[model samples]
Target: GQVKVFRALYTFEPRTPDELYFEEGDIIYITDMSDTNWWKGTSKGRTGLIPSNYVAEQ
Candidate 1:
């Protein structure tokens, strides 16, 4: 037997087909800011940045 959990966050992109891919519950850390206000994020498995406008404080 096994159990699993899942979650998702909202993110917007300037263009369509902008799907951000990351493992569920991946601890993304902030790194740097881009010209478009996108924040650089890093995780053990991967690293990238999504638009800041797409994020909301919890």
Candidate 2:
């Protein structure tokens, strides 16, 4: 499978352990996705879910 990548549009401070904490301009690789709203990704050697709208496909 092709690895999907994305860029953070804004800083996302994780509110849960499953969520990824990322700052604006950081790049992330998506690993999985829920039905909607949330997507799992890896950044800075950490893996967690982030709001889908926070990132744009790259």
Candidate 3:
């Protein structure tokens, strides 16, 4: 596995253009190392911020 890797815990659908979107079982690549409660990363070539609770470390 790479240095930064995570799995989508729950399906996330963005309500705005900034929230981002993610689906179940999505292999997310974390490009940002920020706070613990929320995460800023990219998935499947799409980039956005998803709740850290919805992300699972691999």
Candidate 4:
């Protein structure tokens, strides 16, 4: 898995630019999955409860 930073959580989808699905200060996890999860993220800041699908390697 690559190293990525969690921007924010997507409680509701955006309609303006639809740039990011996460928050600006939200913490996410890093994983090396293929394509079966929903949200992709980590748990460095909070618990290990991170998104298993929605993640970007930026």
Quick one: best TM-score, which candidate?
2
Tens digits of lDDT, candidate 3, 1-58: 2348899888988867877698989988887766776667888778877788888889
Query: What would the per-residue lDDT of candidate 1 be over residues 17-52, giving only the tens digit for each residue?
Result: 333444534444555554566565544555555555
Error of 4 at 2 (Å): 6.1
Enumerate residue pairs that collide in model 1: none
RMSD of 4: 8.2
Q: In terms of lDDT, which candidate is stronger, 1 or 2?
A: 2
Return whichever of 1 and 4 wins on TM-score.
1
lDDT of each: 0.45, 0.88, 0.80, 0.43
Query: Which regions of candidate 2 deviate over 4 angstroms?
Result: none
Candidate 1 regions exceeding 4 Å error are: 1-8, 11-20, 23-27, 34-36
**Runs off by more than 4 Å, candidate 4:** 12-25, 32-35, 38-44
The candidates, ranked best first by TM-score, are: 2, 3, 1, 4
Question: Between the candidate structures 2 and 4, which one is better when assessed by TM-score?
Answer: 2
**Per-prediction TM-score to the true structure, in the order listed:** 0.41, 0.89, 0.80, 0.31
For candidate 3, give the lDDT: 0.80
Which residue pairs in model 2 clash with each other?
A: none
Which candidate number has the best lDDT?
2
